[PDB]
């Protein structure tokens, strides 16, 4: 089945490469990390992968999460893991095309 990380921290991942294959949401998508229908995480932008811990604010459109956050004491928060890809190359450059 092999539902685990496939690009670990500090790895150079190109566009479209799968970062993590999972069953439940162990690792939530972050910056430049997209999700598929099967919860696979894939790298949208070429770069370097990092993992972080952040605050969780679910979609109100979702129901199984918008209510549990409604059951938490003052000063509470649901922290969760995220996997980002800091992009490496810039979008583009400008080069002389015509001298007229």
């Amino acid at each position: 089945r092999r539902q685990g990380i496939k690009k670990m921290e500090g790895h150079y991942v190109h566009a479209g490469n799968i970062i993590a294959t999972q069953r439940h949401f162990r690792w939530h998508p972050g910056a430049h990390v997209g999700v598929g229908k099967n919860k696979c995480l894939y790298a949208l932008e070429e770069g370097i992968v990092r993992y972080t811990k952040e605050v969780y604010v679910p979609h109100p459109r979702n129901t199984e999460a918008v209510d549990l956050i409604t059951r938490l004491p003052k000063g509470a928060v649901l922290y969760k893991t995220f996997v980002h890809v800091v992009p490496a190359k810039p979008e583009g450059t400008f080069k002389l095309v015509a001298m007229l």
Partner: peptide
């Protein structure tokens, strides 16, 4: 992870009676 200081940061079940 389990062998890192950040372990047990995602716990929320204990925050529900």
């Amino acid at each position: 992870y389990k062998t890192k200081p950040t372990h047990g940061i995602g716990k929320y079940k204990h925050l529900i009676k």
